[PDB]
Design a protein around this nucleic acid. Structure first.
Ligand SMILES: Nc1ccn([C@@H]2O[C@H](COP(=O)(O)CP(=O)(O)OP(=O)(O)O)[C@@H](O)[C@H]2O)c(=O)n1
Ligand SMILES: [Mg+2]
Ligand SMILES: [Zn+2]
Lengths: 147, 221, 94, 170, 56, 55, 110, 1112
DNA sequence: TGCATCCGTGAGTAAAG
DNA sequence: TATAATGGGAGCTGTCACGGATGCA
């Protein structure tokens, strides 16, 4: 990008690279239900290791995994996103055998259902905000003040 | 005040090589095999090319047209892949509370392997502008506090400090080290670059990343 | 640019919260025939028709100009939703 | 595919303000048609909605006052302009529509770069955000005059270019 | 002489110091006067403007 | 209620029969003269439902 | 018959079925015109008394979907079939007068 | 006016017939004028000879064919939506071998489409063009192996769908393999089947690096030809019972059957030339005296081993050399489809021969002509190369007829086309134009035949050169292939000659494309003209040598898009090709012999020739083309005119006195103008609309059918329910709009009533009926109205009814009505202009004349182009044109400047000096001195270094005028433009992309069947596509509600869209949406795949999005 | 434990068609 | 409702790169 004179912030490349490093490979299951060579999200294996250490058990030995952008997108948890991406019959057969539930965390899944995406004005952080004039606000504070 | 000169100098139109083809010579040309013709086009567009010169050039013209044609599809495919990996990444909270960070280097090893020399201004800007410092920095009698959003002036100051030998790398919150699940926090992301101020919780940051990497894709030669 | 947009972004912690507040206030105005406006007669946004200046019909213009005054309160969990709806229907019918 | 949408050839229109575009009258009549039927009934232009629709069905039936009614419909409202390819988010931007005779959309000069638009025949699409929510989103978040810096680099994106730079330099 | 880079820096500085409303007004003003002046400046292209240098 | 998840899973023959309103026994679509659906064919109104509302 | 997935044009871009509009489902204009018709009919029926409005709604099918005979409406209200026919007639006459006066239902007759 | 022309190159030969590729290809393939006995074994005759005889016992043999006369002439076919075609009869004879009985008959096989005089076709009433296809020529090739360097692949390629590709390869284990139908087996086996013995192969291949030992297998020579043949059949047919006659049949059909295997005659010749051998037929082997005899295999193996060892005189082949790519023209493509139809007919023939009462079997009882008819009809209606003819202007049709495609049946799939195919090969020189190709996906795959190029009988493109003997340039011209061309040193066409002798010591020439400086002794040939390197379109660009190729491409292509203008003009600067293009395109009309003109009319010209005969040429007047542009011929002679042979009688569309007239000559000022010409936009003067410059006539066709229904007939009627006389004003008695009416959007053109669908009126309908006491009519208004944003003047109505003479419609329809609507389109804001140099832009502003920059003498300019469009694009040619145009404005003359051989700067300066005298000495005589503003501009120019200081005002203005620049006054202020401005005459065309055709908008409208989403396209009143990337745009903004609207309320949330429309017409805020219907379709299409998809809540309890309507 | 080899899959947007 | 009849034709081809499963030595 610099060679072509394109100014572009590292933030964006970092977001993508972060998704490229999303998964990890098991090297020793420890006291877990996992298998050697199994692949899973780094967040999930860290949560499991904290739950096993808090339980006094042996943690899961794991190794960092780098996958390219296509395989990272196909390996994501939401089966709606993965099936709408690419390799639809493969995504769908594995998800249906596994009885996957798509929790609708992302944007594609919610777009497919026509739901309101979890971003912008759709963020839980802002969409529950209320507005009221001081006239009506005092008229309601009086009703709360009577009972 | 020559019109070609003014237009090129101001940034309104034209670059030196086009003006050269108009006034100087057209230059060396490529064969279809990518190998160059030993004989250049000595004519400018003002003088007019010969039939043979024109034909010799049409190879490179067609090669560049086919290059652009085959490149737009690969860029679009890349952008769609980037959108599919990043789309759930949103600014979901104000601070994940991580203590991890990355250190943007201000120097890079010379290709001579001789010493370390300062990185290019634009490169440090694209690495630092609008980021939150993960640690106190004290340079040139100034305190850049932990938690500060690096303004462009903050960046030029850090470049000055590096030029004065006072700092080699800057610690900075980054999405590489953020710990927000399904997304990223506000301090780790930094500026909404489009507003020169901290990002608003709720920004579809992953989509913006994909579009920022993809949109210049068809300019990559 | 929207009149006073920089101050409006100054009001909220997230730009999207400004949008949610403005849109909810605009719907409040449309539902209650603008009878609940916190604007004095001179602060009313006007529209220059062929006849003369008339009330701006655009509830969003109204909501932004109201927001700019300070006479509006916004936040999360200020009141139960049905209490708000019924109190507004009491003070300003349909 | 989507409703309340149109498309036409684009044309420069340098007299516009940054938050503005030129929308042809006929496009606007169709894109805002339900609003226009309602507003026609509000004034005296038709007894009801169905009479207003029958009145707009034929072109020789359409009278001057309806156009004035259209101006009251769109007042303060914005429309989305889009140019394909939509390479990044500034491929869609929101504008306050200024009605025009003629059949070409007028596009402000300072946004051409972000759209990668020139006037060698390009065409853009128009979309009408319907609800108060969508209209507030368009006016706050997607308005041209609020999106001046690049989300990718942070550098100005709407900025002087060819003739503007030329005259200032001169 | 104001050119592409210096005008870009003007827009960015104006943004930081004055807000997007005033910067949008600034941009429209720049557009107005740039167009006006470029009209009457005398800028054109004839073949004798592609000046072949003697050193060639 | 509000949709929050979407599950996908294999369907048992019993589940597939629970979905079905009738077995399609004839490979026939519509009658060449009436232009109405054929009985026990791919368009039978007995299986899939009325062509006209409430009729 | 012909295939709905017949190719149009020389790419793999469009199907022949993509240009076939659905005639079955009512258009938003159609649904809205039906809604405004029902609301204007209730508007004009509120200018009658409750009985003549109910007799009209029973005899034309706006209540339970079907039209009743004069004998059924007369047995329901407890009157003779001639009386129920007469109050239907006077209800229609009042509706005709109100319509000539206000013209609020003409445009729906196409 | 006077036509001064430049140029010093005399062109020995003229341009060949420009449509000869099309016309001659089809003539050769049909042989309709050849008496049957004299026909050659080519074309459809060769197809007949291939299919016949038909055996097994009965035999059906082919004697001859004949083509009758067309049932209807070309115009009648265009009107009646018929195909212009000839009946095809074939004379056949049946023979029973044992009986000896011989029954003979001429059977009718259907029709074959005939090609019109200009090289086009008329299929179902619409003109179509069959585009020539480029492909790899058949033959034997040797390419490098991309894995193993020192190894090479031998490939043996027959005609498309005339046999299998065969590869020979030297494996890592040393044995020589043969790949056929994707099966690798040792070649030694097939060599044995050919009757070769180890002695002969040893003495033929022993010389090469011991490589022949990789061919030595003992188990193969241990068996005779029959055992090796059965071994090969087993190796090629796993599971098939290896019978003897079965194996002989399979191998013969695979390698020696001229009815299954066919190298081209070109493949034959090229194999002969490459391997240095001679071929008997067009197959790799033969069946002679019961055994198989080799033709090609051993020569190929010998060449392969020789190239592998490295012995000289053996080279790998360049497969993009135009000596290895050939053209499949109209005749060859149609012949292939004919051959396929014939094969199907023969299958049916044998089918009927096996059964049936064999006592009474005639030729008529055995031939079902339907498969042949279907194959031809398919080729001409739905082939990738059968394209809707481009007749926007005559140059459009010419270019379309001369285009070469690498796509289509038997060609390349896109995305399977790398850089190599799309490159301009060195051998393209003189054969395929290097600039006329599309920008975008098809670049380098659709190209154009160069202007002097011809395609020979073998299908290779040939270009002409002059013979050069001892530095003397003959007039003997030789058309070469690229293979032939590579043998010679060929000088450039501009090399200076005194008489016929090369007058230069050093000469610029080519050797295998490589440029080289050479002495006249070494020169063997010389180019005919610069014109021979480029296409016809590119040859229409004056000053092409000053234009970057990327923009020449655009100007070249955009001439095809020029709209015929009612006042069209030829350019004031021409290339000298503008007349040939009008003549060859059959646009204009010409005199057949010397004669005197008897009658002249708006409709017809009658000529008395030297034979005393009276010939009447009718004129085509206001006819609608495929693209809706008007095609009318106007007469250009007068009563009593003497005309010689070939003199102009009538100007076609876009012709001015026989010169190609694609646009207007306008007066241009090259300066910015207040942003209204920012970024390629154009500013024009209202004076152009005033004098009807850039005004064009356009005709649209509207059509409606009335058919029989199971509910009663449709009928065209004036009796349409619920309509006033205001709505029926311009409808005639029968219901069709009257010729001459002005129709606007919404106006009825043809009344029609349709019986209502079976419907119980909703109780609301019943009560409204009772209130208004009016029966619902049986029928409903289904009339054909004017679509949004269209209209004009009715000029024709056609009505066809069932039961009328000569008329028969398709089953069911009672009557068909067509209405032709004309419209005169003035230029408007949004329309597209362009010049021949790639400068294109959309009219953005039309100023009144008093705002237009004007010359001191009061003359305002026509259009204002922005100078910022030039430097980045490097199309300086439009500048020189403008300069020359300036001179022509005041001298009152036009010019011919051949490309690369045209007007140079000094001669343009001479002309400009003369013009300045006409422009300024007039002023000095009329009694006016230099103006004060002129002095101010002269001061400014003096500071710019444009004029010398100390000269007089007149001298300095003359200096500027010599630079092409003049003083220009702002119309709005009267103050001068501070600098002198380049003003001059430019040729500018109005392109087919007019905004009237493109502006579209929709609130609500038709929805699709399954998806319940809006239809697409202006014709369907469709909605815009808000695709994946538009969704990303809305997401990145965080416009959750705008996006959700797009996904629900505006597309396919049925309840949502209805409720939104109702809320808006009532004045309420739009309701919250619900599920989009296409997601329900997704759920049901997954259920159809045995996948249970379940919408749950946070308690993992199912949610029914179908509202119970599908749960029992 | 490592390589060759084969099969499946994907390869830009809007427009018109 | 009755001579006897007993194993098929069409392939069709200028990418391309990757990723992952199979196949050999
Ligand atoms: N197949 C296609 C054809 C067109 N387009 C779109 O149309 C424009 C063509 O650029 P362009 O070639 O017109 C830029 P030009 O004006 O010539 O030069 P400049 O840089 O000095 O301004 C691109 O920006 C694309 O977004 C596409 O996406 N795919
Ligand atoms: Mg463009
Ligand atoms: Zn964080």
């Amino acid at each position: 990008y610099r060679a072509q004179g394109v100014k572009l912030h590292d933030k964006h490349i970092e977001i993508v690279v972060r998704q490229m490093m999303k998964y990890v490979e098991v090297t020793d299951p420890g006291d877990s239900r996992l298998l050697e060579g199994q692949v899973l999200e780094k967040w999930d294996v860290e949560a499991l290791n904290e739950r096993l250490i808090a339980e006094g058990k042996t943690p899961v030995a794991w190794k960092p995994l780098l996958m390219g952008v296509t395989k990272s997108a196909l390996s994501t948890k939401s089966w709606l996103s993965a099936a709408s991406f690419q390799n639809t019959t493969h995504v769908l057969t594995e998800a249906a055998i596994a009885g996957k539930k798509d929790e609708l965390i992302g944007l594609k899944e919610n777009v497919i259902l026509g739901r309101l995406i979890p971003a912008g004005t759709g963020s839980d952080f802002v969409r529950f905000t209320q507005v009221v004039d001081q006239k009506t606000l005092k008229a309601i504070e009086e009703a709360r003040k009577e009972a | 005040f020559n019109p070609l000169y003014v237009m090129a100098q101001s940034g309104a139109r034209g670059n030196p090589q086009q003006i050269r083809q108009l006034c100087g010579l057209r230059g060396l040309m490529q064969k279809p095999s990518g190998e160059t013709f030993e004989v250049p086009v000595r004519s400018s567009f003002r003088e007019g090319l010969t039939v043979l010169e024109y034909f010799i050039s049409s190879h490179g013209a067609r090669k560049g047209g086919a290059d652009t044609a085959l490149r737009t599809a690969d860029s679009g495919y890349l952008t769609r892949k980037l959108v599919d990996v990043t789309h759930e990444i949103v600014v979901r909270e104000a601070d994940c509370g991580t203590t991890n960070y990355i250190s943007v280097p201000l120097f890079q090893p010379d290709e001579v392997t001789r010493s370390l020399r300062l990185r290019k201004r634009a490169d440090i800007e694209a690495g630092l502008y609008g980021r939150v410092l993960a640690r106190e920095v004290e340079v040139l009698g100034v305190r850049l506090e932990e938690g500060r959003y690096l303004s462009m002036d903050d960046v030029h100051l850090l470049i000055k400090a590096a030029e004065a030998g006072e700092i080699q790398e800057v610690p900075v919150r980054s999405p590489l080290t953020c710990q927000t699940r399904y997304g990223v926090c506000q301090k780790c992301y930094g500026y909404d670059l489009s507003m020169a101020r901290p990002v608003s919780i709720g920004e579809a940051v992953g989509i913006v990343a994909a579009q920022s990497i993809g949109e210049p894709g068809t300019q990559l030669t | 640019a929207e009149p006073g947009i920089d101050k409006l972004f100054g009001m909220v912690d997230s730009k999207y919260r400004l949008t949610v507040v403005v849109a909810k206030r605009a719907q409040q105005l449309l539902r209650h025939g603008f009878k609940n406006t916190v604007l004095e007669p001179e602060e009313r946004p006007k529209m220059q028709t062929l006849e003369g200046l008339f009330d701006d019909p655009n509830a969003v213009t109204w909501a932004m100009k109201e927001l700019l005054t300070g006479r509006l309160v916004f936040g999360e969990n200020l009141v139960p939703e049905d209490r708000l709806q019924k109190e507004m229907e009491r003070l300003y019918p349909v | 595919r989507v409703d309340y949408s149109g498309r036409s050839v684009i044309v420069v229109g340098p007299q516009l303000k940054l938050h503005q575009c030129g929308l042809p009258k006929r496009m606007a009549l169709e894109l805002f048609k339900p609003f226009l039927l309602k507003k026609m009934e509000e004034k005296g232009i038709a007894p009801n909605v169905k009479a207003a629709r029958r009145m707009l069905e034929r072109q020789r039936d359409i009278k001057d006052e309806v156009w004035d009614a259209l101006e009251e419909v769109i007042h303060g409202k914005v429309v989305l302009l889009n140019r394909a390819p939509t390479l990044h988010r500034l491929g869609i931007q929101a504008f306050q529509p200024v009605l025009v005779e003629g059949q070409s959309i007028q596009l402000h000069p300072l946004v051409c770069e972000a759209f990668n638009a020139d006037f060698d025949g390009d065409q853009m699409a128009v979309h009408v955000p319907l609800s108060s929510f969508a209209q507030a989103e368009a006016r706050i978040q997607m308005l041209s005059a609020h999106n001046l810096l690049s989300p990718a680099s942070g550098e100005p994106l709407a900025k002087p270019s060819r003739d503007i730079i030329l005259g200032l330099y001169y | 002489p104001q050119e592409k880079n210096s005008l870009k820096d003007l827009v960015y500085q104006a943004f930081l110091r004055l807000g997007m409303e005033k910067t949008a007004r600034l941009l429209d003003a720049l557009k107005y006067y740039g167009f006006t002046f470029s009209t009457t400046s005398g800028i054109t292209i004839g073949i004798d403007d592609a000046v072949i240098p003697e050193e060639k | 209620k509000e949709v929050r998840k979407v599950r996908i899973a294999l369907a048992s023959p019993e589940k597939i029969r629970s979905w079905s309103y009738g077995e399609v026994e004839k490979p026939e679509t519509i009658n060449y003269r009436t232009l109405k659906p054929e009985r026990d064919g791919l368009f039978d109104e007995r299986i899939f439902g009325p062509i006209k509302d409430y009729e | 018959p012909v295939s709905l997935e017949t190719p149009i044009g020389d790419e793999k871009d469009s199907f022949y079925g993509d240009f076939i509009p659905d005639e079955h489902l009512p258009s938003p204009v159609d649904a809205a015109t039906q809604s405004l018709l029902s609301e204007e009919l209730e508007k004009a029926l509120s200018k009658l008394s409750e009985r003549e409005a109910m007799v009209l709604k029973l005899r034309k099918g706006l209540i339970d979907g079907r039209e009743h005979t004069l004998e059924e409406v007369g047995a329901f209200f407890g009157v003779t079939r001639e009386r129920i026919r007469q109050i239907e007639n006077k209800a229609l006459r009042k509706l005709k007068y109100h319509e000539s006066r206000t013209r609020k239902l003409r445009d729906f007759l196409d | 006016m006077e036509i001064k022309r430049f140029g010093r190159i005399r062109e020995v030969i003229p341009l060949p017939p420009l449509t000869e590729i099309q016309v001659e290809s089809y003539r050769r393939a049909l042989q309709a004028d050849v008496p049957p006995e004299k026909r050659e074994n080519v074309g459809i005759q060769a197809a007949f000879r291939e299919t016949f005889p038909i055996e097994e016992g009965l035999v059906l043999d082919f004697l001859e064919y004949r083509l009758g006369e067309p049932p209807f002439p070309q115009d009648e076919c265009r009107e009646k939506d018929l195909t212009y075609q000839a009946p095809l009869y074939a004379r056949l004879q049946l023979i029973h071998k044992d009986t000896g009985l011989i029954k003979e008959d001429e059977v009718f096989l259907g029709h074959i489409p005939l090609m019109t005089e200009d090289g086009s076709f008329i299929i179902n009433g619409a003109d179509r063009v069959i585009v020539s296809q480029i492909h790899r020529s058949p033959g034997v090739y040797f390419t490098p192996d991309p894995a193993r360097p020192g190894r090479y692949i031998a490939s043996i390629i027959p005609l498309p769908k005339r046999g299998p590709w065969i590869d020979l390869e030297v494996e890592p284990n040393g044995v020589v393999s043969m790949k056929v139908n994707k099966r690798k087996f040792p070649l030694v086996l097939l060599l044995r089947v050919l009757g070769y013995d180890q002695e002969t192969l040893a003495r033929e291949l022993g010389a090469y690096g011991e490589l022949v030992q990789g061919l030595m297998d003992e188990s193969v020579f241990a068996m005779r030809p029959e055992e090796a043949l059965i071994r090969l059949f087993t190796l090629l047919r796993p599971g098939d019972p290896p019978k003897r006659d079965k194996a002989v049949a399979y191998v013969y059909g695979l390698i020696a059957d001229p009815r299954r295997y066919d190298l081209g005659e070109a493949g034959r010749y090229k194999a002969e030339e490459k391997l240095g051998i001679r071929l008997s037929g067009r197959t790799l082997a033969r069946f002679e005296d019961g055994e198989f005899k080799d033709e090609v295999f051993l020569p190929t193996l010998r060449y392969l081993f020789a190239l592998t060892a490295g012995v000289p005189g053996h080279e790998v082949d360049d497969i993009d050399h135009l000596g290895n790519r050939r053209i499949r023209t109209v005749g060859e493509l149609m012949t292939d489809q004919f051959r396929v139809g014939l094969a199907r007919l023969a299958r049916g023939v044998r089918e009927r021969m096996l059964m049936g009462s064999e006592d009474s079997l005639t030729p008529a009882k055995l031939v079902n002509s339907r498969p042949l008819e279907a194959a031809i009809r398919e080729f001409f209606s739905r082939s990738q190369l059968s394209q809707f003819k481009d007749e926007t202007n005559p140059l459009s049709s010419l270019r379309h007829k001369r285009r070469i495609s690498a796509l289509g049946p038997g060609g390349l799939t896109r995305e399977r086309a790398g850089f190599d195919v799309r490159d301009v090969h060195r051998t393209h020189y003189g054969r395929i134009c290097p600039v006329e190709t599309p920008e975008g996906a098809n670049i380098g795959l659709i190209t154009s035949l160069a202007a002097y190029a011809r395609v020979d009988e073998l299908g290779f493109i040939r270009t002409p050169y002059r013979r050069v003997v001892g530095g003397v340039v003959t007039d003997e011209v030789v058309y070469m292939t690229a293979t032939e061309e590579d043998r010679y040193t060929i000088a450039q066409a501009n090399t200076p000659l005194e008489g016929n002798r090369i007058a230069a010591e050093r000469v610029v020439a080519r050797r295998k494309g490589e440029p080289v400086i050479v002495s006249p002794e070494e020169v063997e040939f010389m180019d005919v003209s610069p014109k021979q390197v480029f296409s016809v379109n590119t040859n229409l660009i004056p000053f092409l040598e000053h234009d970057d190729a990327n923009r020449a491409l655009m100007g070249s292509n955009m001439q095809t898009q020029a709209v015929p203008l009612i006042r069209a003009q030829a350019p004031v600067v021409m290339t000298g090709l503008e007349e040939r293009v009008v003549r060859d395109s059959l646009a204009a009309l010409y005199a057949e012999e010397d004669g005197e003109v008897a009658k002249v009319d708006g409709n017809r010209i009658v000529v008395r020739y030297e034979d005393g005969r009276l010939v009447e040429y009718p004129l085509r007047r206001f006819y609608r083309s495929n693209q809706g542009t008007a095609l009318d011929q106007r007469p250009r002679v007068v009563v009593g005119q003497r005309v010689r042979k070939g003199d102009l009688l009538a100007d076609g569309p876009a012709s001015e006195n026989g010169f190609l007239a694609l646009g207007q000559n306008v007066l241009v000022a090259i300066m910015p103008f207040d942003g209204y010409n920012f970024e390629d936009a154009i500013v024009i003067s209202e004076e152009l609309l005033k004098r009807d410059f850039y005004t064009s006539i356009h005709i649209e066709r509207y059509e409606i059918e009335a058919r029989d229904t199971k509910l009663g007939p449709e009928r065209i009627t004036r009796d349409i329910p619920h309509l006033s006389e205001a709505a029926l004003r311009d409808l005639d008695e029968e219901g069709v709009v009257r010729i001459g009416a002005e129709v606007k959007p919404g106006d009825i053109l043809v009344g029609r009533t349709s019986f209502k669908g079976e419907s119980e009126p909703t109780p609301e309908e019943r009560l409204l009926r009772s209130i208004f006491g009016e029966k619902a009519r049986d029928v409903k208004d289904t009339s054909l109205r004017v679509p949004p944003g269209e209209g004009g003047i009715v000029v024709r109505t056609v009505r066809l009814r069932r039961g009328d003479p000569g008329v028969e419609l398709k089953p069911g329809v009672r009557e068909v009505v067509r209405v032709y609507v004309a419209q005169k389109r003035k230029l408007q804001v949004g329309d597209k202009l362009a010049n021949r140099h790639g400068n294109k832009g959309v009219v953005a502003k039309i100023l009144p004349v008093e705002d237009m920059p004007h010359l001191p003498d009061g003359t305002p300019v026509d259009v204002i182009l922005n100078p910022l469009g030039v430097p980045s694009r490097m199309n300086l040619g439009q500048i020189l044109e403008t300069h020359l145009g300036l001179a022509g404005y005041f001298l009152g003359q036009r010019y011919i400047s051949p490309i690369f051989d045209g007007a140079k700067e000094p001669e343009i300066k001479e002309l400009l000096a003369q013009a300045f005298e006409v422009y300024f000495g007039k002023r000095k005589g009329e009694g006016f001195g230099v103006d004060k503003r002129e002095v101010e501009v002269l001061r400014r120019a003096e500071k710019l270094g444009l004029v010398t200081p100390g000269k007089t005002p007149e001298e300095q203005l003359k200096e500027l005028f010599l630079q092409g620049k003049v003083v220009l006054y702002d119309g709005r202020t009267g103050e001068p433009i501070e600098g002198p401005i380049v003003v001059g005459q430019m040729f500018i065309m109005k392109l087919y992309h007019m905004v009237e055709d493109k502006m579209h908008a929709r609130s609500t409208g038709p929805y699709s069947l399954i998806t319940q989403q809006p239809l697409g396209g202006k014709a369907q009143f469709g909605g815009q596509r808000f695709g994946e990337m538009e969704v990303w745009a809305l997401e990145a903004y965080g416009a959750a509600h705008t996006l959700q609207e797009m996904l629900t309320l505006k597309s396919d949330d049925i309840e949502g869209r209805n409720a939104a429309y109702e809320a808006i017409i009532k004045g309420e805020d739009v309701p919250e949406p619900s599920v989009p219907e296409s997601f329900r379709v997704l759920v049901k299409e997954l259920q159809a795949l045995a996948l249970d998809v379940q919408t749950l809540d946070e308690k993992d309890n199912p949610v029914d999005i179908f509202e119970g309507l599908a749960s029992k």
